[PDB]
Design a protein around this ligand. Structure first.
Ligand SMILES: Nc1nc2c(ncn2[C@@H]2O[C@H](COP(=O)(O)OP(=O)(O)CP(=O)(O)O)[C@@H](O)[C@H]2O)c(=O)[nH]1
Ligand SMILES: [K+]
Length: 308
């Protein structure tokens, strides 16, 4: 028969659960959410269907107070509850802000558990703003290294990059939604790739080949119309204003192109060439195509890049 992949998104700590709440608000389908936190006040406000309060014996229901050893121990002591919530997942996205205690310490434990439960495990984490100081940055760096050791693939968003995309008045919440989009569009892109039957079909086994045990990653989506649409969508898919890891140096790529019946062979080559040339490597590509006749002049390019 057919395979139906279960995708889960797990928020760990404040920032991660913020991202989960905003994704649920934005509306996601076919994805399951898990909220993990020490902070009982924030966890009570989570919109996630599955909630795990960790470390209550250690924190009395408070956060970890920037102590990553308490975050790590809190997750370890709730291993069975975390395993039970994950069980059945084919793919898990662990999202977390690094630099505090709960996210820094517990997110690598959650990711380790997910991988041991058999899930393809992707971390999407932030580094703190420079204005938060050097100690926060150093602690975050230890969290990023622990994440790298625990996940299949890791996407790092330095929060300082948000300062590159705001004007002096952009609300902080609007900026945070831009960082959220990295996770949301990557999850949505995989979900859609799985759900739809393509003319050149890609599926979850291709995602596993490109992402399993591959270190840093990029996940992007680009949409364009009109003249040069394939080139423009491909460039947008690989544009990484918020990413620590750019496309440069990628050695494996999952690339899908969705368009209407006008989708031309020539423009599919144009788009593939953009990704090959930007990588500035010989990229091992798994290429797919979907014809969606509901589309008119719109083209959508999805890119997952690993192998740096
Ligand atoms: N882009 C973004 N960054 C966030 C968000 N919330 C927190 N951050 C950033 O993540 C870092 C850690 O914050 P948070 O996730 O609340 O930490 P925690 O580990 O839960 C806090 P404690 O140590 O007390 O338990 C912050 O220093 C900040 O850089 C958010 O919603 N969006
Ligand atoms: K498919």
């Amino acid at each position: 028969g057919s395979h139906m992949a279960t995708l889960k998104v797990i928020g760990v700590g404040g920032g991660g659960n913020n991202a989960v709440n905003r994704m649920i608000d934005h509306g996601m389908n076919n994805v399951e959410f898990i909220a993990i936190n020490t902070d009982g006040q924030a966890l009570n406000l989570s919109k996630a269907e599955s909630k795990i309060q960790i470390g209550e014996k250690l924190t009395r229901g408070l956060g970890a107070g920037a102590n990553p050893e308490i975050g790590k121990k809190a997750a370890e002591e709730s291993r069975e509850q975390i395993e039970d919530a994950i069980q059945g997942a084919d793919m898990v996205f662990v999202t977390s802000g690094m630099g505090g205690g709960t996210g820094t310490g517990a997110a690598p434990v959650v990711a380790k558990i997910a991988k041991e439960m058999g899930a393809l495990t992707v971390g999407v984490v932030t580094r703190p703003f420079s204005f938060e100081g050097r100690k926060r940055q150093t602690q975050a760096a230890a969290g990023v290294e622990a994440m790298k050791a625990a996940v299949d693939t890791l996407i790092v968003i330095p929060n300082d990059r948000l300062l590159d995309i705001v004007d002096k008045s952009t609300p902080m919440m609007e900026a945070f939604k831009e960082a959220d989009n990295v996770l949301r569009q990557g999850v949505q892109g995989i979900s859609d790739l799985i759900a739809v039957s393509g003319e050149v079909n890609l599926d979850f086994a291709d995602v596993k080949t490109i992402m399993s045990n591959q270190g840093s990653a990029l996940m992007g989506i680009g949409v364009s119309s009109g003249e040069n649409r394939a080139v423009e969508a491909a460039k947008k898919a690989i544009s990484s204003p918020l990413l620590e890891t750019s496309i440069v140096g990628a050695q494996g790529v999952l690339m899908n192109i969705t368009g209407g019946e006008s989708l031309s062979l020539f423009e599919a080559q144009e788009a593939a060439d953009i990704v090959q040339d930007a990588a500035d490597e010989d990229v091992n590509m798994i290429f797919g195509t979907v014809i969606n006749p509901e589309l008119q002049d719109e083209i959508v390019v999805t890119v997952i890049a690993t192998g740096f």
